Amino acid sequence: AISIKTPEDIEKMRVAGRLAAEVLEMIEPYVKPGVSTGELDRICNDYIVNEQHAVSACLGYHGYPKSVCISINEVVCHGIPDDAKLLKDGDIVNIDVTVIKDGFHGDTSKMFIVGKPTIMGERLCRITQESLYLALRMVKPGINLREIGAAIQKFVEAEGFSVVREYCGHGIGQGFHEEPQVLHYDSRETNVVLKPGMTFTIEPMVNAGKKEIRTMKDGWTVKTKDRSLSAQYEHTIVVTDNGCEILTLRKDDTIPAIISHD
């Protein structure tokens, strides 16, 4: 559009964003060696539907068959939960949740390391999260999204890693994937000035190796071409008069929910 949310709209996004975040806090103790991604997905859907009184935006959307996306190791994104896929020590696992409540969407993802961490896994997860946080700290009215993507890329590359090009952040509200596209790297194509009341996600995908990615024969599951590890974190935000408010913050986040400039 780009769609500006009213205060009422924003309050409903606060509620959907909290619910999405709560799914991620809930699922954590279940993420252990020997659990399958299929069970994790069931637990999440059961929780969203029967405790939260909400629904998964994933389920049925363009025919997607499950309720969350679960992406392990070299899978970059859109991993499909499966009863036969079991987690094991050292795995890094992204769970991407999107909840609809009262017509509004809340979208967020985080990494989990399973059992005994490996050093590359810990590092990649930490740097990815730090790249999301740096971008969040830049959001305010007047800024251009190009600057934010540029800053993500500079940081990630300086840390020896690479930024997935083909996937980005997005506006969100009564629609799951709204304008604008929120690129996580510098592009001359990008020119979006932020205004208060915009709501969008930042969701960098970072590869320990080379940025290149291959989609699977299923035209969907995405892996890293060099089979390097890939990590992602995502938050949903609203642009405020002097900053942003994070709508999907968790107790384990180490960034304030409200960021203020001046």
Residues that bind ligand TMG (CB under 6 A): 58, 61-62, 64, 69, 78, 167, 177
Residue 230 touches which of Co ion, Na ion, ligand TMG, none (Cβ within 5-8 Å per kind): Na ion
In degrees, rounded to 5, the angle at the alpha carbon of residue 38 between the alpha carbons of residues 173 and 249 is 35
Residue 58 touches which of ligand TMG, Co ion, Na ion, none (Cβ within 5-8 Å per kind): ligand TMG
- CB 260 → ligand TMG: shortest distance, Å? 29
- CB 197 → ligand TMG: shortest distance, Å? 23
Q: Are 147 and 153 in contact (CB under 8 A)?
A: no
Q: How far apart are CA 148 and CA 185, in angstroms?
A: 8
Q: How far apart are CA 229 and CA 113, in angstroms?
A: 12
Q: Which residues of 56-90 are buried (b: 16+ CB within 10 A; e: fewer)?
A: bbbbeeeebebbbbbbbbbbbbbbbbeeebbbeeb
3 versus 118: smaller Cβ distance to ligand TMG: 3
DSSP 49: I
22 versus 96: smaller Cβ distance to ligand TMG: 96
Determine which residue in the list 41, 74, 91, 96 makes contact with Co ion, applying CB under 5 A.
Answer: 96
> What one-letter code names the amino acid at 216?
M
For the annotated binding site for a divalent metal cation, the residues are 96, 107, 170, 203, 234
Residue 71 touches which of Na ion, ligand TMG, Co ion, none (Cβ within 5-8 Å per kind): Na ion
Phi and psi at residue 241, in whole multiples of 5°?
A: -65, -25
Determine which residue in the list 56, 98, 199, 230 makes contact with Na ion, applying CB under 5 A.
Answer: 230
Q: How far apart are CA 209 and CA 226, in angstroms?
A: 7
DSSP 62: G
162 versus 232: smaller Cβ distance to Co ion: 232
For the annotated binding site for substrate, the residues are 78, 177
Residue 107 touches which of ligand TMG, Co ion, Na ion, none (Cβ within 5-8 Å per kind): Co ion
Residue 2: asked if its preceding bond is cis (omega within 30°), the reply is yes
Determine which residue in the list 201, 207, 240, 248 makes contact with Co ion, applying CB under 5 A.
Answer: 201
Catalog residues that contact Na ion under the rule CB under 5 A.
71, 75, 230
